[PDB]
Design a protein around this ligand. Structure first.
Ligand code: NAG
Lengths: 48, 48
């Protein structure tokens, strides 16, 4: 965390910094998006 | 002189209320700001 790296979560590949998010992902929600249809927050595999 | 001074003071007093009461007196500058915001937001949304 806190250092921008390459991330590959379940086939979703990108670059950036990952931080502990304060979003309230409802239990049926996996990943979030922003106004331009790009991934903003993501849920981890293994530990949730 | 006194009457002219009183008239000028009354007009300058009323001008602030005239600006404050009407919420569409400053429409040109707001239009400029809104146009820039709309153009940028549309350019962002075209990425989807
Ligand atoms: C393996 O993944 C599961 C979720 O599918 C998780 O519950 C479990 O804790 C993981 N194992 C370890 C050792 O973290």
């Amino acid at each position: 965390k806190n250092k921008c790296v390459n991330f590959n979560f379940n086939g979703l590949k990108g670059t950036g910094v990952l931080t502990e998010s304060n979003k309230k992902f409802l239990p049926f929600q996996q990943f979030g998006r922003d106004i331009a249809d790009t991934t903003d927050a993501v849920r981890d595999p293994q530990t949730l | 002189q006194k009457l002219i001074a009183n008239q000028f003071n009354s007009a300058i007093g009323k001008i602030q209320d005239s600006l404050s009461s009407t919420p569409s007196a400053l429409g040109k500058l707001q239009d400029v700001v809104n146009h820039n915001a709309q153009a940028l937001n549309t350019l962002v949304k075209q990425l989807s």
